[PDB]
Amino acid sequence: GVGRVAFVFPGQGTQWAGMGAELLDSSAVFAAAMAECEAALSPYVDWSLEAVVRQAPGAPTLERVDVVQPVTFAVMVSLARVWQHHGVTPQAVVGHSQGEIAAAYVAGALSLDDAARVVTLRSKSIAAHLAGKGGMLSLALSEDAVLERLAGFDGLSVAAVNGPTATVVSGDPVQIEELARACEADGVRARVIPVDYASHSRQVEIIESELAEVLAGLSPQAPRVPFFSTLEGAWITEPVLDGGYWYRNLRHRVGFAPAVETLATDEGFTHFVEVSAHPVLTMALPGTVTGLATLRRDNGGQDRLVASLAEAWAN
Fold first, then answer.
1. Half-sphere exposure of 9 (CA within 13 A, CB side)
2. What range defines the domain where residue 37 resides?
3. Which residue among the candidates 27, 78, 97, 157 is catalytic per the annotation?
4. Any catalytic annotation for residue 97?
5. Residue 198 lies inside a defined structural domain of this protein
6. Where does the record place the region Acyltransferase 1?
């Protein structure tokens, strides 16, 4: 059973210091793609992509969002390019939060200049207003009981429903800690996410008047590869990925489990290739679809690339 392949582009928790550094030396396609992404990013970032990846002394250390998000975007775009170089073209692409931007590029929907602009400017808005103001929390629990436990906490919301077992809430940090302590009181699993902002929450509305000002000139195109939106929760077949879409993506829930249930049950997708620097979503697909990661934390060189290609080809 292989049917169709989907490229998964995750959101948070996939970063690690030095991701792609060994791959910049090992893979010429990856290095070419990362140079192209650096050229695309440079009119916005002030820093250097390769310097951050090679952890040069005068480079940012991925601690801030306005760095870690365009770097993750570049790595995911480049890793998709590597996959396609080795014979694995996606029958579809599906993205999680910021991953959607990367998806939107590999689908052909957005151009690299526009994709880079989206990721960079949204990350800068997050760092200029959302940073240090919010919080996010992963709970090993269904969103059905989680939407119930959000009662009494108007400053919270459901940020993502990644699988039928673990959701992600996002909101005010004090209420995030309160909910985490309440879950630790009933003996449940709770993982406070190391994120100073609160994506997909209400606070994102603050940056709306900013986002529409910096993403207005976008020129989205018809997706060449099918593009399953986890915001609209369905296919995207029209050039409707403008700046408003990129605000909605950041402000509204991530419907990733709906996306994978749809692509698996309906459209015949059997293999999901998580194009990422560390797998964070493959432990959430249904038990019947194959999940294929790319790189792992600190395992991000040619060893890991050939291991992932071997696990894909054995699949």
1. 32
2. 4-131+203-313
3. 97
4. yes
5. no
6. 7-290
